[PDB]
Amino acid sequence: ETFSGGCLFDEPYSTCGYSQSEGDDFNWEQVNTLTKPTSDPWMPSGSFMLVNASGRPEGQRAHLLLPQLKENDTHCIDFHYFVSSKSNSPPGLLNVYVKVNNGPLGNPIWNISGDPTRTWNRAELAISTFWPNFYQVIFEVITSGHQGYLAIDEVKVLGHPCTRTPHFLRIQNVEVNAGQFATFQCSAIGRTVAGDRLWLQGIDVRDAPLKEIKVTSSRRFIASFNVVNTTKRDAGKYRCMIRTEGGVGISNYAELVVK
Numbered sequence: 001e002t003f004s005g006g007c008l009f010d011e012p013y014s015t016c017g018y019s020q021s022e023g024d025d026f027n028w029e030q031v032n033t034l035t036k037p038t039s040d041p042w043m044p045s046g047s048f049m050l051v052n053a054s055g056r057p058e059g060q061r062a063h064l065l066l067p068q069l070k071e072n073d074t075h076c077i078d079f080h081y082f083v084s085s086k087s088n089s090p091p092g093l094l095n096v097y098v099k100v101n102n103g104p105l106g107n108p109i110w111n112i113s114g115d116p117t118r119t120w121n122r123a124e125l126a127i128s129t130f131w132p133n134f135y136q137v138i139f140e141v142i143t144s145g146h147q148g149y150l151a152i153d154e155v156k157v158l159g160h161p162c163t164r165t166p167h168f169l170r171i172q173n174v175e176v177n178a179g180q181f182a183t184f185q186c187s188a189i190g191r192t193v194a195g196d197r198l199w200l201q202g203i204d205v206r207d208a209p210l211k212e213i214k215v216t217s218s219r220r221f222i223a224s225f226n227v228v229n230t231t232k233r234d235a236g237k238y239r240c241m242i243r244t245e246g247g248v249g250i251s252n253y254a255e256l257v258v259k
């Protein structure tokens with residue numbers, strides 16, 4: 001029993017290999033408004049995972065974890081999400097995390113500050129981590145203190161590149177000596193436009209600046225990030241990150257070596 005990674009929440013979520021945490025503050029609820037309706041104006045319809053934020057203080061955390069995914073083909077994760085609030089004010093933050101090969105949680109690769117618009121919005125994830133390696137998508141709500149709803153009514157894992165996000169190509173470790181720049185060549189397939197934010201995130205390390213985006217064709221660009229005048233207190237793991245109006249794409253972790 002492997003898992004596609006995805007879930008309509010029509011069956012119990014453990015059917016999809018989704019799980020929760022007992023190490024945090026609560027749990028997501030699983031609802032179906034067709035089988036038990038609700039006259040709550042701020043409630044969405046259908047089958048979904050819900051956070052009810054009523055009588056929850058600020059700071060409270062709750063994780064819905066995807067099965068570990070061990071993909072061969074370049075693929076796409078998209079989820080569909082909903083937020084509502086009685087106040088014109090948000091019920092919580094929603095964060096998406098990726099741990100790769102059982103690693104540290106790291107930072108949210110994608111997040112909304114949860115503005116309560118009671119509509120559904122798509123977001124797609126383009127993760128470059130493949131068999132024999134694996135990763136785990138983790139949905140984390142953190143409550144604002146005000147009442148309302150955050151919901152996810154379906155996650156889909158498709159076997160093709162993401163449409164609204166470029167995806168990165170394997171990026172190799174970088175090795176240099178001392179007082180001299182270290183260049184990361186974040187090479188992608190797809191299109192990038194104005195709004196798009198592009199960045200190299202290093203754990204425990206101040207982020208290298210975007211140095212340039214060099215577009216080679218309608219389907220290929222390289223974003224390059226320069227860590228200048230390098231020392232030992234610079235060495236660690238780096239990753240390519242693109243945020244577009246549609247999703248987030250992330251390369252594998254490249255490592256930095258200093259001689």
Ligand SMILES: *[C@@H]1O[C@H](CO)[C@@H](O[C@@H]2O[C@H](CO)[C@@H](O[C@H]3O[C@H](CO)[C@@H](O)[C@H](O[C@H]4O[C@H](CO)[C@@H](O)[C@H](O)[C@@H]4O)[C@@H]3O)[C@H](O)[C@H]2NC(C)=O)[C@H](O)[C@H]1NC(C)=O
Pocket residue numbers: 038040043052053054055
């Ligand atoms: C998001 O969180 C909110 C806080 O937990 C929920 O609001 C609560 O919703 C319930 C609705 O069931 C409401 O209280 C009802 O329950 C009482 C306790 O049993 C009861 O006295 C009333 O309901 C009915 O049940 C009794 C027998 O049990 C019968 O005598 C009657 O038939 C009676 O009508 C009562 O209305 C709360 O007022 C409300 N709590 C708060 C603090 O706001 C939301 O439901 C939840 N959203 C969803 C849809 O998940």
Ligand SMILES: *[C@@H]1O[C@H](CO[C@H]2O[C@@H](C)[C@@H](O)[C@@H](O)[C@@H]2O)[C@@H](O[C@H]2O[C@H](CO)[C@@H](O)[C@H](O)[C@H]2NC(C)=O)[C@H](O)[C@H]1NC(C)=O
Pocket residue numbers: 070071072073131
């Ligand atoms: C991702 O790809 C892995 C590649 O291994 C081989 O898979 C078979 C089908 C064949 O196409 C080979 O040429 C290919 O390299 C898959 O690994 C599995 O391969 C077998 C079929 O499941 C299986 O007997 C074997 O035990 C298994 N594991 C290994 C390490 O070889 C893997 O299944 C695949 N995952 C998916 C479904 O994406």
Ligand SMILES: *[C@@H]1O[C@H](CO)[C@@H](O)[C@H](O)[C@H]1NC(C)=O
Pocket residue numbers: 107108109110111112113
């Ligand atoms: C979370 O997302 C916002 C955009 O909503 C971004 O600018 C902010 O800095 C992000 N923080 C992270 C990366 O956790």
Ligand code: NA
Pocket residue numbers: 020021022024025026027028062063064
């Ligand atoms: Na939980």
Ligand code: NA
Pocket residue numbers: 008009010046047048153154
């Ligand atoms: Na659903």
